[PDB]
From a paper:
Processing bodies (P-bodies) are cytoplasmic micrometer-scale ribonucleoprotein (RNP) foci that were initially identified in mammalian cells and that have now been observed in distant branches of eukaryotes. To obtain insights into the redundancy of P-body formation, we turned to the [name] protein that was recently implicated in P-body integrity in S. pombe. [name] is related to metazoan Edc4 (Ge-1, Hedls)19 and both proteins contain an N-terminal WD-40 domain and a central coiled-coil region. [name] can thus interact with Edc3 through a number of HLMs at its far N-terminal region and with the decapping complex through the Ge-1c domain at its far C-terminal region.
Sequence alignments of the C-terminal region of the S. pombe [name] protein with the C-terminal regions of the human, D. melanogaster and A. thaliana Edc4 proteins suggest the presence of a Ge-1C domain20 in the [name] protein, although the sequence identity (17 %) is very low. The structure displays a closely packed helical bundle, where the three N-terminal helices make an approximate 90-degree angle with the five C-terminal helices. The structure of the domain is very similar to the known structure of the Ge-1C region of the D. melanogaster Ge-1 protein. Previously, it was shown that the C-terminal 290 residues of [name] interact with Dcp2.10 To probe if this interaction is direct, we performed NMR chemical shift titration experiments with the 15N labeled [name] Ge-1C domain and an unlabeled Dcp1:Dcp2 decapping complex (Dcp2 residues 1–95). We observe that resonance signals from residues that are located in the C-terminal helices of the [name] Ge-1C domain are significantly perturbed. This result indicates that [name] exploits a surface at the far C-terminus of the protein to directly contact the Dcp1:Dcp2 decapping complex.
Residue numbers in the entry: 935 to 1070
Write the structure that this text describes.
């Protein structure tokens, strides 16, 4: 964890966005997520491949923290990426359906422990994920 945090911190400073996301996905710690969270989702969309973006939301869905502020960031990243992602990109055709399915299931598995604010926010997020699965 500690070696990885050091790399993440330096990638954020340099503005190495893809590198930040890829580093965190390889070592998806809570502390690392908090460093990465300095990078807004729009920068991620400009710099990361669709495969990497799907790797990222999958890892966010598994992260074992339900703290309100952290969960807010978790859900915002997932929402924005899933609304932006082109589910018809051939490069992700063999992963996009199972990844969206696993992402939804992962969030539901944690949902009993979400505060009421985020139980309600999840209903909205699930609708967005289901809409993307509906396209394909």
């Amino acid at each position: 964890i500690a070696e990885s945090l050091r790399r993440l911190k330096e990638y954020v400073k340099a503005g190495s966005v893809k590198e930040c996301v890829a580093e965190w996905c390889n070592m998806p710690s809570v502390a690392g997520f908090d460093v990465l969270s300095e990078i807004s989702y729009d920068r991620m969309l400009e710099n990361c491949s669709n495969l990497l973006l799907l790797t990222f939301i999958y890892h966010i869905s598994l992260l074992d923290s339900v703290d309100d502020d952290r969960l807010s960031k978790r859900m915002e990243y997932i929402s924005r990426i899933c609304l932006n992602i082109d589910v018809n990109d051939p490069k992700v055709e063999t992963v996009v359906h199972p990844v969206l399915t696993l992402t939804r299931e992962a969030l539901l598995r944690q949902s009993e422990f979400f505060s009421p604010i985020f139980k309600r926010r999840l209903v909205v997020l699930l609708r967005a994920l289901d809409g993307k699965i509906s396209e394909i």
